[PDB]
Amino acid sequence: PIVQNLQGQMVHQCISPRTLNAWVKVVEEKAFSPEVIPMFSALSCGATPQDLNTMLNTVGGHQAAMQMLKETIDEEAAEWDRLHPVHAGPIAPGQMREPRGSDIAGTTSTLQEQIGWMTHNPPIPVGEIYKRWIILGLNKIVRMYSPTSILDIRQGPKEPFRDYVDRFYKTLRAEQASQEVKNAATETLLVQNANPDCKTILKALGPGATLEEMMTACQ
Amino acid sequence: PIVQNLQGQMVHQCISPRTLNAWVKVVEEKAFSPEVIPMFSALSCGATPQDLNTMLNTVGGHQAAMQMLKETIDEEAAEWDRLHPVHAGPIAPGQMREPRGSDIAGTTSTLQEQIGWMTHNPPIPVGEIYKRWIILGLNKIVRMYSPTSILDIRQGPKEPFRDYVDRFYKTLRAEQSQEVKNAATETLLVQNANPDCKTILKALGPGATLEEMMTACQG
Amino acid sequence: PIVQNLQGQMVHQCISPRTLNAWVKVVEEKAFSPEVIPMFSALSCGATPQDLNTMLNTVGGHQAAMQMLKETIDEEAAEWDRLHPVHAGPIAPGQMREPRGSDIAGTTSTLQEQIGWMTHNPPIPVGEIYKRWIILGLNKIVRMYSPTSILDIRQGPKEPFRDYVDRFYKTLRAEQASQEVKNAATETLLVQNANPDCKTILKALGPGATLEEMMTACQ
Amino acid sequence: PIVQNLQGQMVHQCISPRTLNAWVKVVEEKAFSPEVIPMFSALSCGATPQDLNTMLNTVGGHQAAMQMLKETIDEEAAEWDRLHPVHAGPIAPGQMREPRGSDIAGTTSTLQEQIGWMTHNPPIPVGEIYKRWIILGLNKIVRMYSPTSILDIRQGPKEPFRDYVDRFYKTLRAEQSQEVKNAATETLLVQNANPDCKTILKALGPGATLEEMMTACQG
Amino acid sequence: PIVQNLQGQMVHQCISPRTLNAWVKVVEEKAFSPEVIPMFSALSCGATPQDLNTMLNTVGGHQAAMQMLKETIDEEAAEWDRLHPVHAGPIAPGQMREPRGSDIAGTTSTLQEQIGWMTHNPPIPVGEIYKRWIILGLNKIVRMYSPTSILDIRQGPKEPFRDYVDRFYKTLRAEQSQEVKNAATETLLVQNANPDCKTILKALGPGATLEEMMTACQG
Amino acid sequence: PIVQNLQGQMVHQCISPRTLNAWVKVVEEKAFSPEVIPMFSALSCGATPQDLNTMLNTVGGHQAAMQMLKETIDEEAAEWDRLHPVHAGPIAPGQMREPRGSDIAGTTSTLQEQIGWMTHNPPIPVGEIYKRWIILGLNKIVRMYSPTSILDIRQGPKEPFRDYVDRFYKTLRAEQASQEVKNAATETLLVQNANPDCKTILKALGPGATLEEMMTACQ
Ligand SMILES: CC(C)(C#Cc1ccc(-c2ccc(Cl)c3c(NS(C)(=O)=O)nn(CC(F)(F)F)c23)c([C@H](Cc2cc(F)cc(F)c2)NC(=O)Cn2nc(C(F)(F)F)c3c2C(F)(F)[C@@H]2C[C@H]32)n1)S(C)(=O)=O
Ligand SMILES: CC(C)(C#Cc1ccc(-c2ccc(Cl)c3c(NS(C)(=O)=O)nn(CC(F)(F)F)c23)c([C@H](Cc2cc(F)cc(F)c2)NC(=O)Cn2nc(C(F)(F)F)c3c2C(F)(F)[C@@H]2C[C@H]32)n1)S(C)(=O)=O
Ligand SMILES: CC(C)(C#Cc1ccc(-c2ccc(Cl)c3c(NS(C)(=O)=O)nn(CC(F)(F)F)c23)c([C@H](Cc2cc(F)cc(F)c2)NC(=O)Cn2nc(C(F)(F)F)c3c2C(F)(F)[C@@H]2C[C@H]32)n1)S(C)(=O)=O
Ligand SMILES: CC(C)(C#Cc1ccc(-c2ccc(Cl)c3c(NS(C)(=O)=O)nn(CC(F)(F)F)c23)c([C@H](Cc2cc(F)cc(F)c2)NC(=O)Cn2nc(C(F)(F)F)c3c2C(F)(F)[C@@H]2C[C@H]32)n1)S(C)(=O)=O
Ligand SMILES: CC(C)(C#Cc1ccc(-c2ccc(Cl)c3c(NS(C)(=O)=O)nn(CC(F)(F)F)c23)c([C@H](Cc2cc(F)cc(F)c2)NC(=O)Cn2nc(C(F)(F)F)c3c2C(F)(F)[C@@H]2C[C@H]32)n1)S(C)(=O)=O
Ligand SMILES: CC(C)(C#Cc1ccc(-c2ccc(Cl)c3c(NS(C)(=O)=O)nn(CC(F)(F)F)c23)c([C@H](Cc2cc(F)cc(F)c2)NC(=O)Cn2nc(C(F)(F)F)c3c2C(F)(F)[C@@H]2C[C@H]32)n1)S(C)(=O)=O
Ligand SMILES: [Cl-]
Ligand SMILES: [Cl-]
Ligand SMILES: [Cl-]
Ligand SMILES: [Cl-]
Ligand SMILES: [Cl-]
Ligand SMILES: [Cl-]
Ligand SMILES: [Cl-]
Ligand SMILES: [Cl-]
Ligand SMILES: [Cl-]
Ligand SMILES: [Cl-]
Ligand SMILES: [Cl-]
Ligand SMILES: [Cl-]
Ligand SMILES: [Cl-]
Ligand SMILES: [Cl-]
Ligand SMILES: [Cl-]
Ligand SMILES: [Cl-]
Ligand SMILES: [Cl-]
Ligand SMILES: [Cl-]
Ligand SMILES: [Cl-]
Ligand SMILES: [Cl-]
Ligand SMILES: [Cl-]
Ligand SMILES: [Cl-]
Ligand SMILES: [Cl-]
Ligand SMILES: [Cl-]
Ligand SMILES: [Cl-]
Ligand SMILES: [Cl-]
Ligand SMILES: [Cl-]
Ligand SMILES: [Cl-]
Ligand SMILES: [Cl-]
Ligand SMILES: [Cl-]
Ligand SMILES: [Cl-]
Ligand SMILES: [Cl-]
Ligand SMILES: [Cl-]
Ligand SMILES: [Cl-]
Ligand SMILES: [Cl-]
Ligand SMILES: [Cl-]
Fold first, then answer.
1. Ligand 2 near C104 CB (within 6 A)
2. CA angle, corner B131, sides to B127 and B132, nearest 5?
3. CB neighbour burial string for B76-92, b if at least 16 within 10 angstroms, e if fewer
4. Partners of residue F12 on adjacent β-strands
5. Which residue puts its alpha carbon closest to atom 45 of ligand 2?
6. What stretches of chain E show up as alpha helix (H) in DSSP?
7. Among A176, A182, E15, F81, which residue's Cβ finds the most Cβ atoms within 10 Å?
8. 3-state SS of E13-51?
9. Which of F180, F112, F138 is nearest to F43 (CA)?
10. What's the CA dihedral at D46, D48, D54, D57 to 10 degrees?
């Protein structure tokens, strides 16, 4: 990663063994459950493109997912290059070449060029741009590896309301879109797919009931 | 988090893999037992709103509770917005715009703006405001997910007094101000002791410490 | 905690995850065995009142003991306030208000006021004063949760002398008073409650025998 | 390793016990699965040749592979020596002699000469040259120790498409440029799908993403 | 402990949770095997008397040994006091009073006075004096708690010579100067070998190394 | 160990608990397998003689090996003293006495004298000299505790060539001499002790076949 020293300079630091192990283990145990995204973002804080490639390369298995990840990165790299055409010309003494999509992804850039971009003034944060592409890709994998659709979450006749809301939002969280789309899913399904006893109780509460009030009413 | 370095400057640091793992593990093993609140507050020392969102997003399961958490944040955010009316105007070079409710929660603010506020002179502790909203929300979850009421905690005829007082205060801590929690001790606590110990505790008279009550019902 | 930076200034540091886990685990495994006191004192090195409250709040179970702890803190807080009456008046630019008992315990003080007291010149060590109250309380719990009295430690007819001295001093250590009181207990009971074979051997050694000599003589 | 301290100077540091243990454990559990290469590269960040030799020497077993590693280092070292003819002459007070192939591998160079080269102005990154030779050698071991060929990876008649693509790319990663690895996807991958999914994938037509192919053979 | 920081100043640091845990665990698993002494000396590097008392107080069980430890400290403390007669007089602003025996053990000295002595110019290493008394006491415990005498360690008729020499020196290390420990080797070691190996070792003659003796009784 | 601070000064640091545990555990699990040597060298990076004695003293068991280690150290100490006769005379204000063999081994030197030697300008690296003696001794133990001779490594009639080369070089690695002696062992035995099928294949390859080519030919 790139961290600040006590001189105020952004300097390269080696990825720690603890960081490597934490990412390998979380994929091993949690696969592509939705909480893999925040874990990857936090463990990759300040990462260079080399570090991000290191983390993803240490993943054993799920190679189908990892190949989908490269294809996502490619489309975003192609989009970056079409929005940022590089201008030919000698690079000045105190300057860095402009990065391509392949440079952000680390396939045509050295770690020293990545450090130069990320510690420039102003910085060009190729690590954070790459991370955005990867997380975009990981969001697709989470949505694809989600077993259940939101339309199949129906409260059982003896199922506690808390367990049903647990399943509802767990399923909704794996299908990542905008929250405009997830507020619409709740208003459409959460009360309507409650069991007949709890459904009649919540209809009387009205659309303005908070979830805390809804969960108290079907206790 | 934003911590002070070895020279006296407030700097951003990445959340450590140990901090991430410790919070995930505590929710896994302890759910929303009352001791989850101090663990979250301590593990989030100096956290930015991004860090707090990271910690909350790494929680697997309990998505109904986490959704109640979201609803609580909204009410407090709306209260914050109603107490801090917006002032339109260009933000000056040196200073920073005033944060809205959605900015404290980190949903409409970048990490650099959160760092900018916290290292301002004087600091606007958006991380601590967000943390307070979260703990307010987590406190509600502990109360809702508490299985037993304090009025149902009563000492068995052969149960040692220590075990009953253990159950009593464990339940009371889950049942959340001291206006009536102070009230449960010494008035409900004696009433639900078994007849053998209850007769002993009348003889002790008012003003007995819990150490005196526990000594008196040892045998 | 409050630690020194390289500038010579006492600055606040976040309580580490390792410190939190160590205290939670030691209570889990050792309950209120006497070695819980030194572990708590060492793990709370440099703690603020907030940190001390954090540690105690993370304890799961033993809520009867924890309530006895608050009552001890209250008496010591009441004693502090009666020995340190606060003098009303505006606090000067370069000064701190005088702390109440409730301020030392952290119920009416912010963490910033605790930092101000502890890093003042000269410092008013509210964290170390609070720690003294807590450890005073923990000493009472260890004495109360001790199963055996010193008068019941008698050497068995086939029990090795080392095992008996182990039990003797383990029991004596849980009943914490002054060592004047513990030297008196040894001179009163250690030889007199030895088995008849070892007792006659040690009587000949006389009162001036070291324990190493006593343990060698009954090998 | 040679890392930058908190002030901006490149200093030698001892390899940490965690780094040593992490590398030993990864070889123990993963042998020469493809993900061993990124783990070794990351754990050896900033390594001197002595550090790289330390890591390789701590490997227990797989001594045939480790001997193949030695032979690879020799060929690259001999290539290095053939591209860098020796210049005889007294080495000047300030500067350092040119490193031979055996010097990069650390067999004829002391640790202080390796530090001297790496902190030179400009640096001669002997640690990174050695690391590159090692990874070149480790890449050969992964290919030789890969049990299955990509031409033998074919989808079963009842095997889910995700599991087959998982096996496909796991094998391809073990079978080492993208000149023909790009070729295996989309041409060999469709051919070895089962007849049910194979018929579906013809209908998708050329240019289908892997996400589209995996969605189309879900059911 | 008192350690040197990154700038060259001797500063007090809190004993780490890992140091506390490591010492507790080593006593739990190894008791007073001889290797407990080096572990305690190394884990207490730079310790203050308070730190040494902390480590000793965290030991659970073995309270008879710990009491023998207390008696040893008293004898050495009394010897220290007899060699350092007290000088009455007001202590000067800059300097510190001379420490008594009870001050080195930390029972009548505060932690700040122990820090003051150790950072004095020249230092009075009260922590190292206390540590030496403790190790003197712990050495006695290892001898008393050693089950077997070196005179009872003899090679079996079918026991491999390596295993017998292993038992021999393990016992000798437990049986504590080299005045007669040097004596046990080469004179008692040959005498207690079995007749087959014993006959071989006479033929080797005086001056054989242990490597030569172990090679000669391999078969 | 002796590490560099940020002032550029070589200063003493306490041996870490992690370093102590790592060395104890690696001996426990791996005994004197050849990889114990690099682990000991890396874990003892920058060690003083006191630290090296600490590490070796923490080893439980294998006391026969540890006694052979002292005898090796003695011969090397005697050789050092006969090559470096000390010159009598008062030591100057800014100087250190010359170290004996017993001073390098730490039996007649204080830790402060070891720090003085190791941080002198120029340094006299008693820690690295001692380490050379210890590793010389550990090499002898590895050779002695090796069960199998290189002449007994013969490929089985159904044994895969990789497994045979594994055994061959594992055995050769435990008998440490020069690589001139180990190149001679390979050319003498590796092909000649292959099974008749693989032997005839490799004879046709000729003496110039790399191991990678040899292992491919007997797949
Ligand atoms: C990527 C990254 C940089 C980031 C970020 C990031 C940024 C902001 C916010 C956030 C914070 C507070 C509020 Cl009040 C809202 C809001 N208020 S709202 C009602 O929509 O209008 N919205 N947000 C997101 C916004 F603004 F982006 F929309 C938020 C989140 C929350 C964090 C959070 C998690 C939690 F458990 C409980 C909380 F109180 C807050 N995370 C999510 O909400 C994800 N989630 N999704 C759904 C579902 F789909 F089921 F509905 C569900 C969640 C859920 F909250 F977990 C919970 C079960 C429900 N994260 S990171 C740190 O991962 O690296
Ligand atoms: C989490 C966080 C945000 C914080 C904080 C926080 C802040 C202040 C205080 C506190 C300090 C001193 C006093 Cl004298 C009182 C007081 N005296 S009184 C008579 O009420 O007026 N009260 N308090 C709480 C105050 F201030 F909130 F009111 C306090 C606590 C105590 C600390 C504590 C914990 C403990 F285990 C044992 C102790 F001896 C002291 N913790 C609690 O009390 C929690 N608790 N709750 C209840 C219940 F409700 F069931 F009865 C019960 C407890 C209990 F004490 F454990 C015990 C069984 C009874 N913690 S943090 C720093 O980790 O981030
Ligand atoms: C003590 C210390 C300070 C050091 C060092 C140290 C210094 C240099 C080198 C080294 C590096 C590269 C080459 Cl190309 C040669 C070479 N080329 S060669 C063909 O001989 O001409 N030689 N060397 C040693 C030289 F120069 F000293 F001879 C080397 C080693 C190798 C490290 C290594 C290990 C490995 F697994 C694979 C590698 F690619 C490199 N370690 C050894 O080789 C030990 N070993 N022994 C034998 C056997 F006996 F079976 F043959 C075998 C090995 C083996 F390699 F493991 C492998 C199975 C074969 N270590 S430390 C770090 O431990 O603290
Ligand atoms: C180890 C180290 C030295 C390094 C590096 C390193 C360097 C660059 C790149 C890389 C980055 C971006 C793109 Cl867009 C491409 C590209 N796009 S493409 C169409 O080929 O032209 N290719 N690459 C590799 C390049 F550059 F080498 F060609 C890349 C990688 C990727 C990172 C990655 C890993 C991952 F898991 C999932 C991802 F989405 C991305 N890792 C690999 O690709 C390894 N891999 N191999 C094959 C195989 F051969 F089987 F098909 C397969 C992979 C796979 F991706 F995992 C996936 C199943 C397919 N890593 S390090 C920094 O740790 O020390
Ligand atoms: C709270 C805190 C800040 C502190 C401190 C603290 C301060 C000083 C001392 C101490 C040191 C040396 C001597 Cl010679 C005496 C002494 N000489 S004497 C004979 O009395 O005249 N006295 N002391 C205490 C003094 F001075 F306070 F009295 C001491 C202790 C000892 C530490 C110790 C433990 C140990 F195992 C072996 C040792 F050699 C020293 N701890 C105790 O002794 C507690 N203990 N109690 C009893 C019993 F009740 F059974 F008798 C028993 C012990 C016991 F020692 F463990 C052992 C089985 C016997 N600790 S902390 C670090 O916990 O956070
Ligand atoms: C704990 C601490 C305070 C310290 C220190 C400490 C200080 C010095 C020395 C030492 C160093 C060099 C020599 Cl050449 C001799 C010597 N040569 S000699 C012929 O006697 O004259 N003697 N010594 C001890 C000295 F100086 F004390 F005399 C030494 C040791 C050795 C180091 C060592 C350990 C080891 F495992 C293997 C080694 F090769 C060397 N450790 C011991 O010897 C302990 N030991 N005891 C006996 C017994 F009594 F059973 F025979 C036995 C050992 C043994 F060696 F292990 C082996 C089976 C025999 N350690 S610390 C720094 O951790 O805080
Ligand atoms: Cl780490
Ligand atoms: Cl790790
Ligand atoms: Cl996996
Ligand atoms: Cl890269
Ligand atoms: Cl790659
Ligand atoms: Cl893989
Ligand atoms: Cl960490
Ligand atoms: Cl971790
Ligand atoms: Cl955010
Ligand atoms: Cl989100
Ligand atoms: Cl989830
Ligand atoms: Cl404000
Ligand atoms: Cl930590
Ligand atoms: Cl932890
Ligand atoms: Cl518990
Ligand atoms: Cl507080
Ligand atoms: Cl509270
Ligand atoms: Cl509880
Ligand atoms: Cl470490
Ligand atoms: Cl480790
Ligand atoms: Cl080397
Ligand atoms: Cl070697
Ligand atoms: Cl091996
Ligand atoms: Cl070069
Ligand atoms: Cl720690
Ligand atoms: Cl720990
Ligand atoms: Cl003390
Ligand atoms: Cl005590
Ligand atoms: Cl005890
Ligand atoms: Cl002195
Ligand atoms: Cl450590
Ligand atoms: Cl450890
Ligand atoms: Cl062992
Ligand atoms: Cl020493
Ligand atoms: Cl010794
Ligand atoms: Cl031993």
1. no
2. 120
3. bbeebeeeeeeeeeeee
4. F2
5. B173
6. 17-30, 36-43, 49-57, 63-83, 101-104, 111-118, 126-144, 161-174, 178-183, 189-191, 195-204, 210-216
7. E15
8. CCCCHHHHHHHHHHHHHHCCCCCHHHHHHHHCCCCCHHH
9. F138
10. 100
Separation in Å, CA E16 to CA C16, C19, D165, E23, F179: 10, 8, 49, 11, 45
Helix (H, G, I), strand (E, B) or coil at A10: strand
- In C, minimum Cα distance to E7 occurs at C6
CB < 8 Å & 24+ apart, contacts of F94-102: F96/F120, F96/F124, F99/F124, F99/F126, F101/F76, F101/F77, F102/F77
State the greatest distance between any 2 C-alpha atoms of chain B, in Å, as a whole number. Answer: 75
The secondary structure of residue E4, as a DSSP letter, is E
SS3 content of chain B, % helix, strand, coil (to 5): 60, 5, 35
**Which structure tokens are listed for A70?**
């490269």
Any CB–CB contact under 8 A between B202 and chain C? no
**Cα distance between residue A27 and residue A22, in whole Å:** 9
E39 touches chain F (CB under 8 A): yes
Q: How far apart are CA F101 and CA F78, in angstroms?
A: 6
> Which segments within chain C are labelled E, that is strand?
2-4, 10-12
Resolution in A: 3.3
Neighbours of chain F (3+ CB pairs under 8 A): D, E
Residue E35, Ramachandran bin (φ over 0: left; ψ between -120 and 50: alpha; else beta): alpha
A167 annotated ligand-binding residue: no
CA-nearest residue, atom 63 of ligand 1: A38
Cβ neighbours of residue D110 closer than 8 Å, sequence gap 6 or more: none
**Which residues from F are below 8 Å from D66, CB to CB?**
169
Distance CA B129, CA D9 (A): 39
E214: contact with F, CB 8 A cutoff: yes
User: Computed over its alpha carbons, how large is the radius of gyration of chain E?
Assistant: 23
Helix and strand tally (H, E) in chain C? 11, 2
CA dihedral E78, E82, E85, E86 (to 10 degrees): 20
Cα distances (angstroms) measured from residue F1 to each of B32, C9, D20, E46, F51: 45, 28, 17, 13, 7
3-state secondary structure of B31: coil
Give the whole-angstrom CA distance, residue B15 versus residue E52. 34
Contacts with E7 from chain F: Cβ below 8 Å: 5-7
Whether C215 and E144 lie within 8 Å, measured CB to CB: yes
The position carrying tokens 């590896």 is A145
**Method used experimentally:** X-ray
Q: Is B44 helix (H, G, I), strand (E, B) or coil?
A: coil
- The answer to whether B203 touches B154, Cβ cutoff 8 Å, is no
Q: Whose CA is nearest to atom 60 of ligand 2?
A: C53
CB contacts of B47 in chain A (<8 Å) are none
